[PDB]
Design a protein around this ligand. Structure first.
Ligand SMILES: [N]S(=O)(=O)[N][C]C123[B@]45[B@@]67[B@@]89[C@]1%10B81%11B698B746B814B562B%10%1143
Ligand SMILES: [Zn+2]
Length: 258
């Protein structure tokens, strides 16, 4: 009875194994655009992905991760609300069964079709596993996806999904450039939060871009052909792998823009 996204093991249940699920800085949250305040203290955001080295893509039974070599300073996120240098370790998505749902963060309660998470760790902590135990251990860059035109820089990801349909399957995924997943603007909201999957640790500075990327219906339909189950098991399509918005509690969402 492992955690997942169904009736019996979904987000409503996670607090039994992971009591921090009802904690003071859980993610995702609704971003109320009228209450978010412009913060002149935020430095410019720096997303330096030119030297990123992808290694592999993996179906972990809740999503797929595109993994990077993080053994040196190649693809880093700096600036904005962050102190120091955060190294890219992987990205993954959350998505829906229908185009009207799928994102984790919401914007004035609007749900997007999906949400990309580029996960980075604070190099002052030496490794990811140490970083997740710190309040400023991780920075996750969140990008909304809406359905419209195709995102060409996503298609390499879409085209390998057939090879990792079921839980535990992985595939070589070198030379993927995550710059092709970024929108034009780096305007963002930022707040302190958590991992949105177990273990739900409260170690993330969230940086959520205002501008969504557009992906095609055909692209998102291929995400929805993945399976939560492993090979040879009854098919459970990998859809609706998102946690809903959690209580904002004693937090302020800051905007980088006027
Ligand atoms: N939606 S999230 O970015 O909060 N998920 C973070 C993850 B992914 B899955 B579970 C938590 B552990 B494994 B791997 B590692 B990273 B961290
Ligand atoms: Zn995520």
């Amino acid at each position: 009875h492992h955690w997942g996204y169904g009736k019996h093991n979904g987000p409503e249940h996670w607090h039994k194994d992971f009591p921090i699920a009802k904690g003071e800085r859980q993610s995702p949250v609704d971003i109320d655009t009228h209450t978010a305040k412009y913060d002149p203290s935020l430095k410019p955001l720096s997303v330096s992905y030119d030297q990123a080295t992808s290694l592999r893509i993996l179906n972990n039974g809740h999503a797929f991760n595109v993994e990077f070599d993080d053994s040196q300073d190649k693809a880093v996120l700096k600036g904005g609300p962050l102190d120091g240098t955060y190294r890219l370790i992987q990205f993954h998505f959350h998505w829906g069964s229908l185009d009207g749902q799928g994102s984790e963060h919401t914007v004035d309660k609007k749900k997007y079709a999906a949400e990309l998470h580029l996960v980075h760790w604070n190099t002052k902590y030496g490794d990811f596993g140490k970083a997740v135990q710190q309040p400023d251990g991780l920075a996750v860059l969140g990008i909304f996806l809406k359905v419209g035109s195709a995102k060409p820089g996503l298609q390499k990801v879409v085209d390998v999904l057939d090879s990792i349909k079921t839980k535990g399957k992985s595939a070589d995924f070198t030379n993927f450039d995550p710059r092709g997943l970024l929108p034009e603007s780096l305007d963002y909201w930022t707040y302190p939060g958590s991992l949105t999957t177990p273990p739900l640790l409260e170690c993330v500075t969230w940086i959520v871009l205002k501008e969504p990327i557009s992906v095609s219906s055909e692209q998102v339909l291929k995400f929805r052909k993945l399976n939560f189950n492993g090979e040879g098991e009854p098919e459970e399509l990998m859809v609706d792998n998102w946690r809903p918005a959690q209580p904002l509690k004693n937090r302020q969402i800051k905007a980088s823009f006027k």
